[PDB]
Design a protein around this ligand. Structure first.
Ligand SMILES: O=c1ccn([C@@H]2O[C@H](COP(=O)(O)OP(=O)(O)O)[C@@H](O)[C@H]2O)c(=O)[nH]1
Length: 369
């Protein structure tokens, strides 16, 4: 039993699990498992961080589902000011941040056999991990491209600097490789799915009729549903965890649900006629076609999908539209309604995914070079 440390600006305790949470669940099955949460400060708090409900636990270890969680709270955290004249202040703050890890981080690094750094702020601690524990296998999990996150220049330069020294760079999408300045240690590992997705998919939340589903708040475009619901009165749109309420534009054929536990979303997904990834913008990375979690979930079931053209990507059963263009929304839906359900996409479970995250060389198909 190996001991894992995950560094991320997620916190493991926050209710909507992201990819790193699912991986972390798998790590917790394999060995000790600590999740150290970064980029959280007093500043964070006065800006609406998802982690604020955890604030009274800050800087202490809390056990959550077999994971040791630590939300690091500093007074300020370094960030992209987005003003290129403020750069040397940024560099200063990132250097300062990186130079002042808490003892708990250092201890956890020392205790770890494997340290996973999620793309983002965690980059600032890769070198530190190498110094603290050169025996630790250093796994960078690229949930997102650095440029997409729009990290400070410091983090890009630092990532570029340290990236070759990482044991594993596990890209969610090969499309991320262009901006990763390393080769021999760069691997492709999607997105897992729950090993029991098919069992979770039964029963059925839906009565008779045609049901379409959207799950998730990422770039949530209510206007999609404004148009789609009006244009398709015979379709019931199930809008789950959109991060917002009932937009006044929604037709009565839209059902708006609060955030739903992942396992419970699945029946809504499996038994839908088609799913929707209503990203409000096409100013999105090319990799989002691969990295979108909801689209992966639809894909698992072969659920035809309506999504912006920019995230259709190299996939069947995705019908692109232009956000804000009613005609294209209607055309895409019209096609989705008639698309057959076929499981085109191979979806490894989270356990098999985590295996390849940790030892991609044992699975040579993951190699990008
Ligand atoms: O109330 C919710 C909202 C989101 N999700 C899931 O959370 C993941 C991420 O959703 P988000 O929109 O934030 O990102 P995306 O899927 O579009 O990448 C997706 O698999 C959703 O299916 C969920 O289970 N319940």
């Amino acid at each position: 039993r190996p001991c894992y440390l995950v560094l991320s600006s997620h916190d493991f305790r926050t209710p909507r699990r992201a990819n790193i949470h699912f991986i972390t669940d798998q790590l917790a099955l394999r060995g000790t498992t600590r999740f150290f949460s970064l980029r959280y400060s007093r500043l964070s708090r006065m800006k609406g961080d998802m982690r604020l409900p955890l604030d009274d636990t800050a800087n202490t270890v809390v056990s959550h589902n077999g994971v040791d969680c630590y939300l690091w709270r500093t007074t300020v955290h370094p960030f992209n000011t987005r003003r290129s004249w403020l750069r040397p202040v940024e560099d200063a703050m990132f250097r300062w941040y990186a130079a002042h890890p808490p003892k708990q981080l250092l201890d956890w690094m020392r205790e770890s056999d494997v340290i996973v750094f999620e793309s983002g702020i965690a980059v600032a601690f890769i070198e530190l991990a190498k110094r603290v524990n050169p025996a630790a296998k250093l796994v960078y999990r690229a949930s997102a491209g650095l440029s997409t996150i729009n990290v400070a220049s410091y983090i890009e330069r630092e990532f570029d600097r340290v990236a070759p020294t990482l044991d594993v760079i596990a890209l969610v999408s090969p499309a991320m490789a262009a901006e990763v300045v390393s080769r021999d240690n760069v691997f492709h590992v999607g997105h897992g799915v729950d090993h029991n997705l098919d069992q979770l998919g039964d029963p059925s939340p839906y009565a008779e009729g045609i049901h379409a589903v959207a799950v998730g708040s990422m770039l949530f475009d209510p206007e999609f549903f404004v148009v789609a619901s009006k244009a398709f009165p015979q379709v019931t749109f199930h809008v789950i965890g959109s991060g917002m309420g009932r937009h006044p534009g929604y037709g009565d054929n839209v059902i708006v649900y609060g955030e739903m536990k992942h396992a419970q979303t699945i029946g809504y997904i499996k038994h839908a006629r088609f799913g929707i990834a209503p990203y409000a913008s096409e100013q999105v990375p090319v990799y989002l076609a691969d990295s979108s979690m909801k689209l992966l979930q639809y894909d698992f079931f072969g659920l035809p999908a309506v999504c912006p053209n920019a995230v259709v990507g190299p996939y069947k059963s995705r019908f692109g539209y232009t956000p804000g263009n009613a005609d294209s929304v209607i055309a895409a839906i019209t096609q989705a309604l008639e698309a057959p359900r076929v499981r085109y996409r191979q979806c490894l479970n989270w356990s098999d995914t985590t295996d390849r995250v940790l030892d991609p060389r044992a699975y040579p198909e993951t190699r990008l070079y």
